[PDB]
Design a protein around this ligand. Sequence first.
Ligand SMILES: CN(C)CCCNS(=O)(=O)c1ccc(Nc2nccc(-c3cnc4cccnn34)n2)cc1
Length: 274
Amino acid sequence: MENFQKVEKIGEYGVVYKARNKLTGEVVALKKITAIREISLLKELNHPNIVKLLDVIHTENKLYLVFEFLHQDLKKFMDASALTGIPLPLIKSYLFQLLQGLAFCHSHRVLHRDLKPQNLLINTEGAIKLADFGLARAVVTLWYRAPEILLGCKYYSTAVDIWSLGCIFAEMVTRRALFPGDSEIDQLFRIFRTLGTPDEVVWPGVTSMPDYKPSFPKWARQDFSKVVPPLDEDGRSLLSQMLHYDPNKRISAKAALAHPFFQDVTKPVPHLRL
Ligand SMILES: CN(C)CCCNS(=O)(=O)c1ccc(Nc2nccc(-c3cnc4cccnn34)n2)cc1
C-alpha cells in the first residue's frame, strides 16, 4: 500500500478513496476493508457495465481492493440534474446498460444485494457501471431494499437486484425517491401504501414469511399513472413487472432487455460537470 497515495475521500464494508499509483501514475479507486477466495473470484468477473477489479492486496491482516476509476456517481448526477431532470433517452440508455450488467452477473450466479445511486458510476462517454458487486456476500439506506428481504426471507434470489433497479428507474424519472423509508417497518409500510398490502392472491406464501404479521394494515393499490406520471405506457408496464411482489413473478434482467420499451434505445452523452 505504500505504492498508493490517497488523493481524496470518495465515500464510506469499508472506506473508498481516490488514489494514485506512484508506480505508474495511474488514478484508481481504493477500498479499505473464505473471504480471500470469494474476492479473488470477482476479479475474473469482467463486463463493460461492471467496474473492473484490478487487484486485491492482503497485508497486515488488512484487505485492500483496487478498482478502475470512473468520473462521477449517479447520486451526484441526479442532484445536479434536479432542475430540469435527466433526459428520457439518457435514462433509457442507463437502464438498458445496467440490465445488461445484471444479466451477466446473474448468469454467473452472482448477486449485488445493495444497489443504490451511490454505487452506480458514469463516465463522459455515456457508459454506466455497477460497483461493489459480490462484495455484499463476502446510516445505511433502506430505500431500495426488496420486500422479501424486509419480510425475513433467508435465501433470496437475483430478483432483489431487479427490485432495487426498478426503484432507481422511478427516481430518475420523477426526481423523487419512490420509497423513502427511515426504518424497516416504515420502509415496508411505504411499499404497502403504494403497491397494496400483499396477500396470498398476489404473493403465494407471503403470510408464512418469518416477519409477516396478520396484524399488518390492509392498504389498496394505486395506479402507476399517479406513481410515475412522466413515464410513457411502455415504461410503466416494464416498471410494474420489475416491482412485482412475488420474486418468482418479477421479471428477469434477460427478459427485461427484450421489452418494447427498449426498441428505440440509443446511447446519448451526458453533460457532466467535473
Ligand atoms: C458525498 N459527496 C461529498 C460526494 C462524494 C463523491 N461522489 S462523486 O460523484 O464526486 C464520485 C464518486 C465516485 C467516483 N469514482 C469511482 N470510480 C470507481 C469506483 C468508485 C466506487 C465508489 N464506491 C465504490 C464501492 C466499491 C467499489 N468501487 N467504488 N468510484 C468519482 C466521483
